[PDB]
Nucleic acid binder design. Structure first.
Ligand SMILES: [Mg+2]
Ligand SMILES: [Mg+2]
Ligand SMILES: [Mg+2]
Ligand SMILES: [Mg+2]
Ligand SMILES: [Mg+2]
Ligand SMILES: [Mg+2]
Ligand SMILES: [Mg+2]
Ligand SMILES: [Mg+2]
Ligand SMILES: [Mg+2]
Ligand SMILES: [Mg+2]
Ligand SMILES: [Mg+2]
Ligand SMILES: [Mg+2]
Ligand SMILES: [Mg+2]
Ligand SMILES: [Mg+2]
Ligand SMILES: [Mg+2]
Ligand SMILES: [Mg+2]
Ligand SMILES: [Mg+2]
Ligand SMILES: [Mg+2]
Ligand SMILES: [Mg+2]
Ligand SMILES: [Mg+2]
Ligand SMILES: [Mg+2]
Ligand SMILES: [Mg+2]
Ligand SMILES: [Mg+2]
Ligand SMILES: [Mg+2]
Ligand SMILES: [Mg+2]
Ligand SMILES: [Mg+2]
Ligand SMILES: [Mg+2]
Ligand SMILES: [Mg+2]
Ligand SMILES: [Mg+2]
Ligand SMILES: [Mg+2]
Ligand SMILES: [Mg+2]
Ligand SMILES: [Mg+2]
Ligand SMILES: [Mg+2]
Ligand SMILES: [Mg+2]
Ligand SMILES: [Mg+2]
Ligand SMILES: [Mg+2]
Ligand SMILES: [Mg+2]
Ligand SMILES: [Mg+2]
Ligand SMILES: [Mg+2]
Ligand SMILES: [Mg+2]
Ligand SMILES: [Mg+2]
Ligand SMILES: [Mg+2]
Ligand SMILES: [Mg+2]
Ligand SMILES: [Mg+2]
Ligand SMILES: [Mg+2]
Ligand SMILES: [Mg+2]
Ligand SMILES: [Mg+2]
Ligand SMILES: [Mg+2]
Ligand SMILES: [Mg+2]
Ligand SMILES: [Mg+2]
Ligand SMILES: [Mg+2]
Ligand SMILES: [Mg+2]
Ligand SMILES: [Mg+2]
Ligand SMILES: [Mg+2]
Ligand SMILES: [Mg+2]
Ligand SMILES: [Mg+2]
Ligand SMILES: [Mg+2]
Lengths: 71, 59
RNA sequence: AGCUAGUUGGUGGGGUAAUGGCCCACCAAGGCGACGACGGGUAGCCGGUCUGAGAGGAUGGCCGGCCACAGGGGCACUGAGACACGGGCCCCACUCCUACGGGAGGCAGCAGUUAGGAAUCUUCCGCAAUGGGCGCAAGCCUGACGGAGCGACGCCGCUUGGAGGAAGAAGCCCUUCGGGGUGUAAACUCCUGAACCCGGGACGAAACCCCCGACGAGGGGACUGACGGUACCGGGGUAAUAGCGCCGGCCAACUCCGUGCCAGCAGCCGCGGUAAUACGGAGGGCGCGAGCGUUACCCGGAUUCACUGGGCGUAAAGGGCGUGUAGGCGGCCUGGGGCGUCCCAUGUGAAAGACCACGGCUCAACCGUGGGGGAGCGUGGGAUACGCUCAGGCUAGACGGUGGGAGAGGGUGGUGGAAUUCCCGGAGUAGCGGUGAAAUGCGCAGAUACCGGGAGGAACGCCGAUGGCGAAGGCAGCCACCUGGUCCACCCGUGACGCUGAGGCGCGAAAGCGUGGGGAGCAAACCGGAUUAGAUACCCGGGUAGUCCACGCCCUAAACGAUGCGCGCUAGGUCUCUGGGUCUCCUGGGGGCCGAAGCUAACGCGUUAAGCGCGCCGCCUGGGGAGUACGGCCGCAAGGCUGAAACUCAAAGGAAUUGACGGGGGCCCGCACAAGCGGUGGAGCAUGUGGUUUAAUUCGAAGCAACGCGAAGAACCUUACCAGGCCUUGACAUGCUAGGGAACCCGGGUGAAAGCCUGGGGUGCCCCGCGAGGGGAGCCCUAGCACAGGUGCUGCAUGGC
RNA sequence: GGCGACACACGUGCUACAAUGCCCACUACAAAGCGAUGCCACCCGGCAACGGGGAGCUAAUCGCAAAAAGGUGGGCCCAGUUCGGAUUGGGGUCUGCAACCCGACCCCAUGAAGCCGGAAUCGCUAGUAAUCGCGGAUCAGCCAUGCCGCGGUGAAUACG
RNA sequence: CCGAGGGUAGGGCCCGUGACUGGGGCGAAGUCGUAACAAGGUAGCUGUACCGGAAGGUGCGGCUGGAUCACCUCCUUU
RNA sequence: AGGCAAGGAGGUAAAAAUGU
RNA sequence: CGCGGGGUGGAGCAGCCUGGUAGCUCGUCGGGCUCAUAACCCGAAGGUCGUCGGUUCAAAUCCGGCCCCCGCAACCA
């Protein structure tokens, strides 16, 4: 089906966490565990706590996101 | 849960076939879609049996 | 790891069909046990079944045999036989009735309900066959059985057609636009003719019964079908279900679109972060086919628990060694026993299966018949090479005697100097010590350095080794004592007394702890100083335990040769130490090094083997989890032995090789530093950049190798950016549909220009006609098109440079 | 219009901070390159940039063009000044359609900071650095102190 | 008498839960340091002890699975 | 006297954290 | 109220006491160094020494008062 019921919401990076996972403080509520998108990894675009990043959130479990946008 | 995306909620009866998933921790088990609450993989058209998809009707 | 008290045996009795601790009375005090008892888990066992080359491993469904149990427990009774599945009694669990006093129950028989659960059948017919029971018999019963039903659950068989039929329809897909693919596949022609209908229709069933015959044999006769109106034959008769998995490697089969480390796949490696042979879909293929895949589980592959058949120096793996028990193994000769071992015969090893042969159901599954094998085991005979055992003997093993020898072997008692510190005495004064630098530290009460003595405690310089000793840990002044081991030489004595060693007992560095001493240095902890971002550290100044001794305990280690011990063989050389010799060379025993054969993954090993063997022990089966938990033992504690799993990862590793790297080494180099001259940074400005601001400050370049760079020339241009006006096949390219005007020039309006709107001169070319006029070439305008255009995004898509 | 914006920072260069100098005047030697609507001899106007007139070349044959530092003579005398030249005002010259943003040039006035530069750092081994001018290419003009090129004077020191 | 079973006290064992705690594995871009691999910048490693955020540090001994066995100056003999 | 080498001296080899 | 000591670049502290002559560390900013960050190094920025006075040719400094900050006592009532 390839499902795009995905939320593309902004969030200022709160927490530096392991493995390029970063709890990011969304303006869609709380700070979910949001991990780096592969593109970012490829391009070596560094996320530190405090970046207003777009975070991809599936309805199934919003717990985990994705840092879509480069800050 | 395999397939293309499930319809499973919470208080739903599911059936397990096992078989280690390599990537995931604590998970040595596949859910077998196509029985009980795990209804078949909709839009699935190639490899049906593994997924619980009924035959689509040709011309 | 100990278990046992009716427990092991005895005597007498009872009980039993019968032995017996089955039970009882009495006596004895045994019995079992590491060859693994008791305890716990697990589990009916087997013939077999599956796998497997086999040895094996698992499994014990159906079918057959044995057991055990019929809600759980306990008990008998009757009987030939039960401790009695649809018999009894009792307690309990549970359901049922109850007039609350009590009763009835038991599908683990068929079938079915219900629960659990991934999941498993019809509340079927029949007594026909076969068997069971009863009976003189007829017959009666028979959910044994015989069949049918339901389920591709398994095996096996058949159908979904066949024959033709294009240099290749469409449909779909790909394409380098030609073409290719699908695919003779289709359609279409021809034939057959499952299904399906009708006609017939069993073999299975001839007995038991009746009569002749004596109710014997024999002879005749009769009845007798659930399957099933089935199987099957005869005619008719229609082209009449295809699915499922995969498609990177393993592994058989490849392309495009969609997706962009997302969604997803995955059995492993892993694939996906924009050209995916790994994902989703399509075509194409390929595997199989009424199935095919997934999952579980077992074997295999795993020679990955290894008997066949792996090992252990470095990969996981040798125990710390010694002594030694059980156990295992054992020289040479002669003879007997004949237990092992072999062999023959024979008994067994039921049937079914598996294996071969043939037969039956149209084949086959399936079944039938016949045969063969079969490990094992019993019984009788045989054989003695080998093992065992008995006897005799041998000297090669092993042990001893005598003669010696080497040695830091161990313990006990002593002593001998250097040195250290500490004390006194002396002389002597301004610092000593310490460091990469320093500081803390001591010193004027006079240190340090120097001499004299004394007090101690500890250790043993040189020799000293690449050396010697021990079994290991280990061990050094020297002497004395006690005392082990060992080596040779003689081959003299013994006559296999040996090798190994689960356990056991003993030793076991260093640290540690207990009791008492001693205490110079050194010196954990600790207190200082520096060093440093920080300093619990490296470096310095102290400094407590401890080091030292006695007695006790601890028992670990890179307890290393990371190489268990024992013997036999299999080139040498070279150095060493230690013994004998007929002593510039031989021959033993140790210690090293190089290397034959051979081994090994290579390094390396190589008569001191990791070679070839044999013997026995120890241990190993991926890493982490972890030498941890848990128990158990030991210990005064610290801890030690003994030692998992759950989970987790597709690795942990060894040895080498290529490089790279090293505040590793040697050899080299360069304006690299030094040697020198002149700057840069400080100033202003010239410039380019980052940042910032902007409507935009176009874009890039990024350490050397971006920064007077592209730019070797930004006022407009350039120019790529912004604001405004405007243009649309368009500034430029090749064309089309085509419609008029079309070569050309000159203006005018509006306007910042560009553009837009617009006048008017202006048509010649080819040509046909007398002319009116007509079409086409060049060239141009308009509307739609194919397209142009892009300094627009990607130099991890690239070429060039 | 913007690329040139500017509270800042950096890089690369120039010009300096003086008297081994600076200014003025005369005087002397280069090489290499260019030049056609291009270079411009010479003449006059102008303080001048240049303007006008105009010969010459088609370039070893003319022109750019004076090379500069240097040599002689004069001044300046150790000062922020005759060092230094930025900024700022004013007048102009030239190119082009047009220099306001944003040109160069001339002339006059203005005369800021700077008295040899902190850590760090870079170049250079011989005609080399250091300094001194000239040519060019692009280009109407030039923000060129850049680059590329050519000569003049001409060193130091390398133990290691 | 024997006797299934029941009751009273004790233990063992397993299963369920278990407040409390040990607590382990993996994980790209968490934090503090930098222990180890090169003489890893004090060799390492090893047992043991005491101490420290933590790697660890140091003591005592052991080992080589340790590199480096240099370059001037002096003495002592060839 | 030099020639080489063996050994003993002593001087020197400072320090310097990390990871796109 | 009584007494002692001190007030200092932004913070901590030297110097005062012995008149002239103000330093370091931490912090600020910039640079360097580094491939890069810290660390590092450098600078640059930055104090009239609480303040009013006087002393003296000249005060962080000699001296007084106020302002603070620290502490000790504050007794007989
Ligand atoms: Mg998503
Ligand atoms: Mg008897
Ligand atoms: Mg008994
Ligand atoms: Mg049992
Ligand atoms: Mg069982
Ligand atoms: Mg077996
Ligand atoms: Mg019973
Ligand atoms: Mg009886
Ligand atoms: Mg019974
Ligand atoms: Mg019965
Ligand atoms: Mg029974
Ligand atoms: Mg039943
Ligand atoms: Mg049910
Ligand atoms: Mg159920
Ligand atoms: Mg059945
Ligand atoms: Mg019936
Ligand atoms: Mg009757
Ligand atoms: Mg009946
Ligand atoms: Mg049957
Ligand atoms: Mg056909
Ligand atoms: Mg026909
Ligand atoms: Mg019929
Ligand atoms: Mg293939
Ligand atoms: Mg798949
Ligand atoms: Mg791999
Ligand atoms: Mg696959
Ligand atoms: Mg696919
Ligand atoms: Mg199957
Ligand atoms: Mg190892
Ligand atoms: Mg022995
Ligand atoms: Mg023995
Ligand atoms: Mg024996
Ligand atoms: Mg023998
Ligand atoms: Mg048989
Ligand atoms: Mg048979
Ligand atoms: Mg047949
Ligand atoms: Mg004998
Ligand atoms: Mg002897
Ligand atoms: Mg002797
Ligand atoms: Mg004295
Ligand atoms: Mg003899
Ligand atoms: Mg004799
Ligand atoms: Mg000490
Ligand atoms: Mg300190
Ligand atoms: Mg300390
Ligand atoms: Mg010390
Ligand atoms: Mg002690
Ligand atoms: Mg070992
Ligand atoms: Mg042994
Ligand atoms: Mg020896
Ligand atoms: Mg020897
Ligand atoms: Mg060889
Ligand atoms: Mg060798
Ligand atoms: Mg080996
Ligand atoms: Mg241990
Ligand atoms: Mg324990
Ligand atoms: Mg380290």
């Amino acid at each position: 089906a390839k499902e795009k019921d995905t939320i593309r919401t902004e969030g200022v990076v709160t927490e530096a966490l392991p493995n390029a996972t970063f709890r990011v403080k969304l303006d869609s509520g709380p700070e979910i565990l949001a991990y780096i998108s592969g593109k970012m990894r490829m391009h070596y675009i560094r996320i530190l706590p405090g970046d207003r990043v777009v975070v991809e959130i599936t309805p199934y479990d919003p717990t985990r996101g994705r840092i879509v946008y480069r800050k | 849960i395999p397939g293309e995306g499930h319809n499973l909620q919470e208080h739903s009866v599911v059936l397990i076939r096992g078989g280690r998933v390599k990537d995931l921790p604590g998970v040595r088990y596949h859910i077998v879609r196509g029985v009980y609450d795990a209804a078949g993989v909709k839009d699935r058209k190639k490899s049906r049996s593994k997924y619980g998809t009924k035959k689509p009707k040709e011309a």
